[PDB]
Symmetry: C3
Subunit: 212 residues, 3 copies
C-alpha cells in the first residue's frame, strides 16, 4: 500500500501541472481601459440610463460574459464600515464587473485586496485618503481611481454616487472583506445569500460559455 | 343497558375531550392576540407633539402615554437613555414599553448617523419629532426623506439604508418577535464597540419592561 | 506544635495570600510613576495648535524628545497606521507607549463618526486642527471643540464622537493601556479584516514597550 501513496501524488502532480499551465495561458475578457472608457462615455447621462446603456454595450462587445436581465439584481454591501449596493454583471475567478453606489453616501475602509480594482465614477463624488498620507483626493464623474493590490485607503462617497467597478486578481479572496460587516454588524443573512448566489450565477455563466 | 356507559371508556373519552378542547383553545390564543397599543396610535400620538422641542415633546408624550395605558409604561425610576450601536450606525434609546411582541421607545441622535436598518421578524414604525430621516430602499437607486410629523414604516423582512441628520429624534413602535430584533441591536455593541456596560443597560431595560408586563398581568 | 485542618489551613492561606496581594498591590500603587503629568501633553500640544498640522506635529515631537529623552520613539519607528474602531476610522502615529501611559498623534482627512469607546483609562485629546463633536451619554445635546481645546475622556465614560474633515489632535492616555488596544482593533478584526494594519499597530506598541524597557533598565 506504500506504492498507492506514490500513485496518489502522481496524478496529483499531473493535475496540479495541468492547472498551473491553464492559470498561466489564460487570457482576460475585459481590458481596464475598455471598461473605463464605456463608463466615461455615459457619465453625463442620469445613472439609471447610463447603467442600461453600459450593460447593453457590454453584452454586444462580449456576448456570453454578461449576466442576463433575469439574473441582474441590486444587493446591499456592508463592508469596512461603509454601505452601498452592487449589481454584478460579470464574475469569474480572476475578473469581475459590477455597478456600485449609494444614495445616501458612506465612509470607511476601502478594503485591502489581493486584486487590482478600478472604479470609474458615473455620478457623485469619490474621496480617497491614501495610507501614510494626511491629505485626501477627490475624484469626479468620468474619472477613474485605481486601487492596487495590498493597498488600503479610507474612502468617502458623497450623496448619490455611482460607479462601474472592474476587478482583477484573486476574486474569491475579496468576498471575505465584502461580507464581513454583513456577518458581524448587520446580521443580514438574506443579503449574504443574494451575494453568494450572484457570484454563483456569474461563475455558472463563464463555465457554460467556455464549454458552449 | 343500551343507555349505559362503561366507566373506563368514559374516563378515556373525557381525556380525549380535554385533549381536543385544549389543542383547539390553544390555537385561539393567537386569534385573541391583543396588542396594548394600536398600530397607528403611537404614530398619531407623537405627531401631535412634533411641534415642540424634543425634550418637552418626550416628557408630555410619556405623561400622555401613561394616562392612556396605566401599568404599561416604565416609571421615571427606570427610564434611561442608553446608547445603541447597530448596523454601522449609532444612536440613543429610551425604552418606554417592552414585551415579547411589542415595544415602544424614544430614539434619536445628536450628531446624526448612517447604516443598515436591519432585517427584523417584526414591523417597525418611526414617527419623527425633530430632524430628518433618510431612507434608501433595497432594489432602488434613490432615497426618500421624512420630516417631523411623518411616519416611516418598516415592514418585516425589509432592508433599507438609513440616515439620520443632526439632532433627529423619534418615537418607535415595533410588533413581532422582539427578542430576535434585540440580537441585531447589540451586534455592533459586541463586535465593534465592546461596550459591555451598554449591553447590560439595554438588557436591564428589557428585563424591567418584561417585569412590568407581568406584574401588571398579575395585578 | 499542633495540626491544622484541611479546611482550616486552606482558609488561613487564603487570608495569607489576601494579606500579601493587597499590601503588594498597594505597594505597587505607591511606587507608580508617570513620565508625563496629567495635563502636560495638553499644555504642550496647545502651543502648536493653529499651525499646519504637519508643522505642528514635527515641532511637538522635537519638543517632547527634548523634554523626555528615552521616552519618545525614534524617527525610523514613527509610522502612520489606520485605526478602525467603534464605527469610526482615522490614522494614528504612536509617539510613546507603555503599560500605563501612551502618547499618539491622531486624526482623519475625511472625517468620521462613532462610539468613543469605554476605557479603563483617562484619555485627553488636544485639537491641533479641524473639529471635534462630542455627545455625552444621557444627554440630548452635543458640544463642539475647536483647535487649542482639550477633550477629557474619564474612565468608564462613553460618548458619541464626530471628527470634521482634516481634524488632527494629540492624545494622551493613562490607565490599563492593553485593554484600550482591544477596543482600537475591534473593527480591524471584525469589519476590515486588515491583518497588515493589525500587525502594524501591535508592532508600534511593541516598539514603545521595548524603548520603555531599555530606558528603565539602562537609562
Ligand atoms: C497575490 C495576488 C496579487 C494580484 C495582483 C493583481 O491582480 O494585479 C493585477 C494586474 O496588475 C493587472 O494586469
Ligand atoms: C477601492 C474599490 C473597493 N470597492 C469599492 C466599491 C465596492 C466594493 C465591492 C466589491 C464587491 C464584490 C462583489 C462580488 C464579487 C464576486 C466580488 C466583489 N462588492 O462591493 C469594493
Ligand atoms: C427601521 C427602524 C429600525 N430601528 C432604527 C432605530 C433604532 C432601532 C432600535 C430597536 C431597539 C430595541 C431595544 C430593546 C428591545 C427589547 C427591542 C428593540 N433599540 O433601537 C431600530
Ligand atoms: C476618547 C478618545 C478615543 N480615542 C479616539 C481617537 C483614537 C483612539 C486611539 C487609541 C489608540 C491606541 C493605540 C495603541 C496603544 C498601545 C493604545 C491606544 N489608537 O487610537 C481613541
Amino acid at each position: 500500500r506504500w506504492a498507492w501513496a506514490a500513485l496518489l501524488l502522481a496524478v496529483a502532480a499531473v493535475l496540479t501541472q495541468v492547472v498551473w499551465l491553464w492559470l498561466g495561458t489564460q487570457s482576460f475578457v475585459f481590458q481596464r481601459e475598455e471598461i473605463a472608457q464605456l463608463a466615461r462615455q455615459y457619465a453625463g447621462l442620469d445613472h439609471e440610463l447610463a447603467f442600461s446603456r453600459l450593460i447593453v454595450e457590454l453584452r454586444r462587445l462580449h456576448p456570453g460574459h454578461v449576466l442576463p436581465d433575469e439574473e441582474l439584481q441590486w444587493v446591499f454591501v456592508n463592508a469596512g464600515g461603509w454601505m452601498g449596493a452592487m449589481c454584478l454583471l460579470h464574475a469569474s475567478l480572476s475578473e469581475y464587473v459590477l455597478l456600485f453606489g449609494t444614495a445616501l453616501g458612506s465612509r470607511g475602509h476601502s478594503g485591502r485586496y489581493w486584486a487590482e480594482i478600478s472604479d470609474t465614477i458615473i455620478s457623485g463624488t469619490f474621496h480617497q485618503w491614501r495610507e501614510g498620507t494626511t491629505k485626501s483626493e477627490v475624484f469626479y464623474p468620468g474619472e477613474t481611481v485605481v486601487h492596487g493590490p495590498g493597498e488600503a485607503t479610507a474612502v468617502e462617497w458623497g450623496p448619490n454616487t455611482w460607479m462601474v467597478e472592474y476587478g482583477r486578481g484573486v476574486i474569491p479572496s475579496t468576498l471575505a472583506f465584502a461580507l464581513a460587516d454583513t456577518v458581524f454588524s448587520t446580521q443580514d443573512f438574506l443579503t449574504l445569500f443574494y451575494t453568494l448566489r450572484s457570484y454563483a450565477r456569474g461563475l455558472r455563466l463563464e463555465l457554460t460559455t467556455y464549454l458552449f
